[PDB]
Paper text:
However, PDO does not oxidize elemental sulfur directly because its direct substrate is glutathione persulfide (GSSH). Here, we report the first structure of a recombinant PDO obtained for a representative from a group of colorless filamentous sulfur bacteria, [name], and provide a comparative structural and biochemical characterization with known PDOs.
The [name] PDO structure reveals dimeric organization and contains an αββα metal-binding fold with two central mixed β-sheets, each containing six strands, surrounded on both sides by helices. In the [name] PDO structure, 14 residues from the C-terminus are not visible, which indicates the mobility of this region. In the active site of PDO from [name], the residues of the first coordination sphere of the iron ion (His57, His113, Asp134, and three water molecules) are identical to those of other type I PDO structures. However, in the PDO of [name], Phe146 makes a hydrophobic contribution to the active site surface, while the charged group of Gln147 participates in the formation of the dimer interface. The second coordination sphere of the iron ion in the PDO of [name] differs from other known type I PDO structures by a single residue (His117), with His replaced by Cys in hETHE1 and BpPRF or Ser in MxPDOI. The His117 side group, unlike cysteine and serine in the corresponding position, displaces water molecules located in the internal cavity of the enzyme, which can stabilize the hydrogen bonding network near the active center and affect the enzyme activity.
Author numbering:
A (entry chain B), B (entry chain A): 1 to 235
Write the structure that this text describes.
Amino acid sequence: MIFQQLFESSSSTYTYLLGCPITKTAVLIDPVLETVERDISILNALGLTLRYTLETHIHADHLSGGYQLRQRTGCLIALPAIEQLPCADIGIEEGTPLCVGEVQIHPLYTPGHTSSHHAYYVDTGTHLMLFSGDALLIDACGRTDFQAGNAGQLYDSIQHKLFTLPNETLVYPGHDYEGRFISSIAQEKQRNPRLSNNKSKQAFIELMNGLKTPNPRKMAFAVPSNKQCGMCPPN
Amino acid sequence: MIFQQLFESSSSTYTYLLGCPITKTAVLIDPVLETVERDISILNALGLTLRYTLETHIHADHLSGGYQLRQRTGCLIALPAIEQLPCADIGIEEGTPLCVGEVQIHPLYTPGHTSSHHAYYVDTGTHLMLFSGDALLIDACGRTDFQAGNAGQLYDSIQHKLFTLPNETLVYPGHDYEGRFISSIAQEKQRNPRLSNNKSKQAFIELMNGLKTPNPRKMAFAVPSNKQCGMCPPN
Ligand SMILES: [Fe+3]
Ligand SMILES: [Fe+3]
C-alpha cells in the first residue's frame, strides 16, 4: 500500500496519504486547506487519483482541504455520519469500512475531544496503523476544554478503543508540536504522561482540567467552515 | 508477517520476533539470555519453529541467547561474517538476504558503535522496518567510547546507510532507556538532538566525546561470551 505522512507547519497537522497500487486510487486523511496544492502535486507525481478525503473530526485549528480537493479532483468527502452534514458525501461509522481499492479503512468511534471524533485503522498484513486523530497524541492527547470536550469520555475512548489494540499497533497522530511522527500503542501505555502507570479516570480528569492553553486562533471560523466541509465564510 | 517487539528490562534490549505465517518459521533478532524461556514460550504459543537467531553486533551489555536457543530448538545462529566467529552457523553480509520463509531480511553494514555492527531492514509491502541495533537509537545513538568506538565512522554509517532510507521507514532500535519503542527516519532527521539540523560531523564527534556514561556492568564477560555466541564462561 502506498503511504505518505505529510505535515502542515502552521497548524502542526499531519495529513495521511494512502494509495492502492492496483487501482491507482487514494484517500487523504485530514487534508489541510493551506496544503491543497502540495497534496495534488504529490498525487500527480505518484499517478494516483484522489477518490476520498476523510476527516477524523470537525477541526477547530485549521480549515479542511476537502471542499477545495473535491472541486479540483471530484473526490468524495467522507466524515462522521453522526454530524449529519449535507455537504459530505459519505457518512463514516464504526463497523462499516471505507474501501479505497484493496485498502480497507476501519473507523473507531473515539469521542471526547469532540463529540463525533473518529479514529481509523488499517491492517497492512504486518502492522495495524492507527490514525488516532486528536484522541491519542504522542505523549499527550487532544485537549478537552472545548465546548463539547469531555475528559472522562476521552479517557473511555482511549482505554476502550485504542489501548485494547495490540502492542505493536502504529500510532499516527493528528498533530505534533515537537517533531515526533509516530508512536506505538505499547509506547503510549508505557510512558504517555497523561495515561501511564494505570492513571485512573479521576486523576486524568484533574490533570486535563489543570491545563491552561490559549484557544486556537482560528477556532471562530474553522469549526463552522468545517461543518461546511471547508467552505470559507463570506466574512 | 508475524511481528513482535520484546523488551528485557535488565539491559533494556529489544528482541524482535519475525515469523512467516505460511512456513511457520521464525527468526529472533538480538535474543537475550535472561529471556530465553519467554522467547521459547512465545514461539510455541504462536506455533512457530525457530529457524535463525540474528545478532546486530557483539553485545557488550548482555549475553546473547543464541547459544542456548540453538541447544533447545536446533536453530542456526547468524551474525556478521566479518567477526569470523567459529560458533556461528551463518555469516551475515550486506547484499545477501537472510531468508525466513517468504520474509527477506536485508543486512546493512553500519559500523561505529563496533566495527562489525550490522542493521537489518524488512519490507512489509507498506513499510520498510529498520532494525537499527545500536547504530541509530531513538533521540540518541550508540555509545562510541568502547575500543572500536568510532564517532566519525558511526556518523557516516547513519548518514549514508540509514538517513537515505525513505521518510516513513520505521526505526526499531536495539535499546531504549526511556520507554520508547519506535521512531521513523523522518522523525530522527527532524529532532534527534545528536543528528538533527544537519549537525556537522565535527560537531557530532565533539558531542560524542563529551558524553560520559558508565560502562555496562557485564562488559568484561559479555563480549568474550558473545564471541562464543552467548556461551557462558566457566568461571
Ligand atoms: Fe482537533
Ligand atoms: Fe551495543
